[PDB]
Design a protein around this ligand. Structure first.
Ligand SMILES: [Mg+2]
Ligand SMILES: [Mg+2]
Ligand SMILES: [Mg+2]
Ligand SMILES: [Mg+2]
Ligand SMILES: [Mg+2]
Ligand SMILES: [Mg+2]
Ligand SMILES: [Mg+2]
Ligand SMILES: [Mg+2]
Ligand SMILES: [Mg+2]
Ligand SMILES: [Mg+2]
Lengths: 131, 63, 273
RNA sequence: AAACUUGAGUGCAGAAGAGGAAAGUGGAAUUCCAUGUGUAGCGGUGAAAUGCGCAGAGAUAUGGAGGAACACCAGUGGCGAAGGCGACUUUCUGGUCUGUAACUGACGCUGAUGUGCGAAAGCGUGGGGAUCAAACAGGAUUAGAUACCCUGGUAGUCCACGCCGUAAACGAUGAGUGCUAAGUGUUAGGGGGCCCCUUAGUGCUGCAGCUAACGCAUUAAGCACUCCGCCUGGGGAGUACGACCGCAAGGUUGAAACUCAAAGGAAUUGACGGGGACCCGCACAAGCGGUGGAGCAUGUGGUUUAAUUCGAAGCAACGCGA
RNA sequence: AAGGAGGUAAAAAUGG
């Protein structure tokens, strides 16, 4: 059965991006919503909507494409997994694409990006890479 | 095309209805194929079972 | 049915026996018993005329109704009992008028079941009827050869015959031997197969048990002397050493047929075994 | 620690099914037995022979005995975890699918070790025995033919109960879960107006993506997460030793020394095939005239001789070098 | 009209 909702969400985003879809609806959760908000703030997606219905709610992402129809999201990679969880220190925080990408992290100070983790000098569980 | 049973609305086939079974039996007594008689598969199964019942009770011939 | 003994001794090793689960009473009906002294294969001259009989456990005879001539009155199977005088078991039945009799116990006969005899009896195991009234294809046992004499055919454990067809005065039957023969349609038979089907499987296991059964040892011809047996003599072991194996009394004994000619039954016997 | 209904089950209303187990009934056909008619063959093959038959075969008609399988329906159809399940009837019984939204409230997925089922052959005990048929016998073919072919034919093939536990047991594709263009069939349903929508299967075609290529492609071999099993060059070898299992046959687990520089996959071009389709040719067909028969001329083989010079041998050597 | 799936006939000397 389902074992990694975050991986499912990332794969939904990847598949929609490949097929060049405009919107993407998935079941919601707080971690997923925070991930989507980070993506929007960083500019990888266009908009995020939350539908506060029954059954845990729905997230409705809107993907972003640049000029020439180029895809803003090149790739998403799950880093920490149920089968093996990954943590890093503040001084060991990895840079995605030499800084051109973001590493979504989960920290005592909320789920943030690797840039914010380095700035605040904190580590945590490296949820994902996005570039 | 259309199925005789589906059109007439009959939802059961009685093995003692020899006149009806003669419609779908061949000249030599073989059961005519569904693709020839036009019948549905659902009622083709019923028809085959009814025909075999009648054969056992000697209402209809084997050969 | 069959019980296999553990090899606690070389005597018991490979021995088996009936479990006697079918038997429902372990003592016989006193009033149906008669004494049965042993002959040990010795005739009215006091001479041994059949070899290998002698000794063995004492036995009482159970009077058995092979005739089944008490018609139109039901009888209830009181019990199934052991009988040392035959391979089959025997059923004590009690007629509705209070007369009690032993019959051969058919396979499947149960205590409390009802049996009947006569032309009007139903075709069910243990009922006795004339072959006239028994349908074609029915399996029967305890078959008469002469009407009213009593059953003589298919009485051993597991024995049965099959009714095949009905000529005018005779009925065709296939016997356990495979012979197909005619039997007068006034002769009676009992529906079913004789019980105790596992009888033949028993591994007797040791010499002493044969002795208990009253069987004395069989000495082979080849280990006697010439004056004893046609196979006797020769230095060391010898093969048969003549054109045919011989009986102790000097007759060929492998393939030689002995049924006598010009017998009344030869025109009733339709197909040999 | 406390809540939720989306996963998972349950209730309620429905659907189909060769799912399984046990009894019973039935038609066709094969073999055999008996009898009537009847004459000299039958059968078989590339062609034959063995074999059967003048004691009356084979053919034909009737009746009987018995075993085994279920013609048509029948379908990329159905059912089952897999193996597998196809005449009909009755009894017992398993699973699956559809709609509903009362009901429980995460109770789920996977699954080492374990425990069961598991085609065929095979083993034991007891039955049964038509057909077919390892072994085997004879005949044929052949250089030989322990075969292919023919005539027989035992185990076995069938049943019960135990055993064995393996197959190219294959979709050569582990289970669960979600997500990612479309077109068109079919099986069992459901909803809204022949049409549309929809659930679960079963097929075909085909994007993106994947792939060494072939190909796969909502029944993934795409994109992802969880768990299990498995692989690490070819032989040696599924062998040896040990262990466990088995009545046995054998099964499961499972190396090494030594040896080679390959072994392999997909695809390409050729060549080839006791593979195929088509087209053409005095290749058949139509027709006229011949050769093969006679004498003779000539060439060739053979034989002979001292030598009968050498060369040419299917078409494409032989009135050929000449 | 051209391709894919199932069943199913008839034929057959031997060696290249
Ligand atoms: Mg004796
Ligand atoms: Mg001596
Ligand atoms: Mg003598
Ligand atoms: Mg002697
Ligand atoms: Mg000697
Ligand atoms: Mg078998
Ligand atoms: Mg043969
Ligand atoms: Mg295997
Ligand atoms: Mg495999
Ligand atoms: Mg489908």
């Amino acid at each position: 059965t389902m074992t990694d909702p975050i991986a499912d969400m990332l794969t939904r985003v990847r598949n929609a991006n490949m097929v060049r879809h405009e919107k993407l609806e998935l079941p919601a959760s707080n971690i997923k919503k925070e991930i989507a908000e980070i993506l929007k703030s960083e500019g990888f997606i266009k908009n995020v909507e939350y539908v506060e219905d029954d059954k845990q709610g729905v997230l409705r992402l809107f993907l972003k494409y640049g000029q020439n129809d180029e895809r803003v999201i090149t790739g998403l990679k799950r880093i920490s997994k149920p089968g093996l969880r990954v943590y890093a220190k503040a001084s060991e925080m990895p840079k995605v694409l030499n800084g051109l990408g973001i590493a979504l992290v989960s920290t005592s100070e909320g789920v943030i990006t690797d840039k914010e983790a380095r700035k605040r000098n904190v580590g945590g569980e490296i949820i994902a890479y996005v570039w | 095309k259309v199925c005789y049973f589906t059109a007439n609305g009959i939802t059961h086939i009685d093995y003692k209805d020899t006149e009806l079974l003669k419609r779908f039996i061949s000249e030599r007594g073989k059961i005519l194929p569904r693709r020839v008689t036009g019948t549905s598969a659902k009622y083709q199964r019923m028809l085959t079972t009814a025909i075999k019942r009648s054969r056992h009770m000697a209402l209809l011939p084997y050969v | 049915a069959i019980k296999k003994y553990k090899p606690i001794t070389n005597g018991r090793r490979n021995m088996t026996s009936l479990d006697f689960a079918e038997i429902t009473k372990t003592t016989p009906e006193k009033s149906l018993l008669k004494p049965l002294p042993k002959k040990a294969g010795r005739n009215n001259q006091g001479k041994l005329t059949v070899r290998h009989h002698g000794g063995g456990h004492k036995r009482q005879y159970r009077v058995i109704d092979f005739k089944r001539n008490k018609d139109g009155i039901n009888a209830k199977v009181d019990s199934i009992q052991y009988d040392p005088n035959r391979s089959a078991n025997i059923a004590l039945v009690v007629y509705a008028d209070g007369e009690k009799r032993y019959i051969i116990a058919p396979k499947g006969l149960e205590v409390g079941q009802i049996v009947e005899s006569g032309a009007e009896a139903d075709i069910k195991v243990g009922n006795a009827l004339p072959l006239q009234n028994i349908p074609v294809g029915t399996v029967v046992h305890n078959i008469e050869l002469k009407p009213g004499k009593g059953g003589q055919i298919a009485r051993s454990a597991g024995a049965s015959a099959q009714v095949l067809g009905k000529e005018g005065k005779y009925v065709l039957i296939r016997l356990r031997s495979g012979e197909v023969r005619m039997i007068l349609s006034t002769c009676r038979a009992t529906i079913g197969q004789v019980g105790n089907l596992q009888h033949e499987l028993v591994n007797v296991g040791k010499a002493g048990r044969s002795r208990w059964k009253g069987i004395r040892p069989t000495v082979r011809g080849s280990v006697m002397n010439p004056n004893d047996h046609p196979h006797g003599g020769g230095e060391g072991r010898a093969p048969i050493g003549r054109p045919s194996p011989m009986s102790p009394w000097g007759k060929p004994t492998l393939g030689k047929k002995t049924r006598r000619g010009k017998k009344s039954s030869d025109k009733l016997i339709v197909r040999g075994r």
